[PDB]
Paper text:
A [name] ([name]) from [name] catalyzes the reduction of nitroimidazoles such as PA-824, resulting in intracellular release of lethal reactive nitrogen species. The identification of these residues and the lack of classic catalytic residues in the active site suggest that [name] functions primarily by precisely orienting PA-824 for efficient direct hydride transfer from F420 and potentially through additional transition-state stabilization.
As expected (Manjunatha et al., 2006a; Taylor et al., 2010), the backbone trace shows high similarity to proteins in the split barrel-like family of flavin-binding proteins. All but the first five amino-terminal residues could be built into the electron density for both crystal forms (36–151 and 39–151, respectively). The asymmetric units (ASUs) for the Apo-1 and Apo-2 crystals both contain single molecules with similar structures (root-mean-square deviation [rmsd] is 0.96 Å). This alignment omits 14 of 113 shared Cα atoms because of conformational differences in the same regions that differ upon coenzyme binding. In Apo-1 and Apo-2, α helix D is highly disrupted, with repositioning of residues 129–144 relative to the holo-enzyme structures complementing movement of the post-β3 loop. In Apo-2, this helix stops at Y136 and instead a helix forms upstream from residues 139–143, and residues 136–143 display higher ADPs.
Residue numbers in the entry: 39 to 151
């Protein structure tokens, strides 16, 4: 393994159009039994499909290493974004090179048991 390794969580959501499962690797934080997941970049012309899927069906699966969790996903509240965003930037310093508005558009999703 190289200095370039970036831990990711595989988030599986239910496709909003077909109901088929869809997987996306995302950046994440653990907080007790919560897993916080976020897109790796922002300011997109479109929200990512995994985020639109979990808006329609909050029931998701998160895999970290070989551990599989069934969780229910919801947007971080304003307070939770303020709480988690600095820990995300610490864990993934590539976020530092984004401007303000870019950051405010990143989905930050709390998945809980």
């Amino acid at each position: 393994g190289t200095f370039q390794k970036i831990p990711v969580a595989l988030l599986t959501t239910t496709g909003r159009k077909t109901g088929q499962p869809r997987v996306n690797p995302l950046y994440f934080l653990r907080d007790g039994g919560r897993v916080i997941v976020a897109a790796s970049k922002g300011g997109a012309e479109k929200n990512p499909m995994w985020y639109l899927n979990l808006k329609a069906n909050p029931k998701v699966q998160v895999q970290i290493k070989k551990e599989v969790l069934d969780l229910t996903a919801r947007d971080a509240t304003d307070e939770e974004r303020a709480e988690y965003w600095p820990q995300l930037v610490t864990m993934y310093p590539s976020y530092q090179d984004y401007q303000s508005w870019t950051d405010r558009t990143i989905p930050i999703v709390v998945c809980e048991p």
